[PDB]
Amino acid sequence: DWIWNRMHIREEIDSPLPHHVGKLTSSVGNKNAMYIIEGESANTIFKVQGYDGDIYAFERLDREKKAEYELTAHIIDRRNNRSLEPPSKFIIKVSDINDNAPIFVQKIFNGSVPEMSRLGTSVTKVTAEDADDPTVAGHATVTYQIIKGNEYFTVDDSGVIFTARADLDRESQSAYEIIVKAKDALGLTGESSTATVIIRLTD
């Protein structure tokens, strides 16, 4: 279905308040009429600025705090306070910007793998989460790199760590401490965007 009862405003707008959100339109043509709103942050963050039905935002918004607001519109005869229309529900949607980097879910991950496993043996999985909107182009798309120990292990872009060599010998080294870094597809990183993986070689 087509969804038309929506307004959209970008988060984190850094030009001077207030900021234009969108415009209400009722077909009545009583010019004693006024647009009135109620609902989530109606008349605090979002205010009508008239007489045309324009709604403005009076705070900078963070989609990661609240991503949308449910409001209801009216239109009122200011002579007699009569409601001229049925009220109309709508949503003000806060449009995502890429303002978060992926952050690992743990400071230290642990795994193990038998010594002398074939090249490309899966060891363990690391995970970083990006607080941006995962339905927007790439904003919460996470990619991974090993930045210390990449000669010994590789990582795929799901965070899966694999042996990078077929000759890992427990006698030479029984525990690797490797450093992983995460970074969203638009390049945003990072700290808490690194972590450590302790990988023990088993006998």
Query: What residue ranges bind a second copy (CB under 8 A)?
Result: 1-6, 8, 22-27, 50-52, 73, 85, 88, 90, 136-137
Residue 156 binds Ca ion (CB under 5 A): no
Residue 100 makes contact with Ca ion by CB under 5 A:
yes
Is 133 assigned to a binding site?
Answer: no
Q: With CB under 5 A as the contact rule, which of the stretches 109-117, 119-127, 162-170, 188-196 interacts with Ca ion? A: 188-196
Partner in contact with 62, chosen from Ca ion, a second copy, none, beta carbon below 5 to 8 Å by kind = Ca ion
184 binds Ca ion, rule: CB under 5 A: yes
Q: Is 169 annotated as a binding residue?
A: no
Minimum CB separation from Ca ion for residue 22, in Å?
20
Is 184 annotated as contributing to ligand binding?
yes
- Mention every residue, 6+ apart, whose C-beta is less than 8 A from residue 126: 104, 109, 144, 155, 159, 161, 180, 195, 197
Q: Which is nearer to a second copy, 31 or 107 (CB)?
A: 31
Strand partners, 87: none
Q: Is 132 annotated as a binding residue?
A: yes
Concatenate the DSSP letters of all residues of 44-95 into one string: TTEEEETTTTEEEESS---TTT--EEEEEEEEEETTTTEE-S--EEEEEEEE
Q: Does the annotation flag 98 for ligand binding?
A: yes
Cβ atoms of 174 and 200 within 8 Å: the answer is yes
Cβ-contact 181, 189 below 8 angstroms: yes
CB of residue 138 to a second copy, shortest distance in Å: 10
CB of 2 to a second copy, least distance (A): 4
Q: How far apart are CA 45 and CA 106, in angstroms?
A: 36
Exactly one of 42, 45, 53, 96 binds Ca ion (CB under 5 A); that residue is: 96
Asked if residues 187 and 181 have their Cβ atoms less than 8 Å apart, the reply is no
Taking Cα atoms as reference points, which of 10, 191, 203, 197 lies closest to residue 98?
10
Q: Which position among 38, 59, 62, 177 is part of the footprint of Ca ion (CB under 5 A)?
A: 62
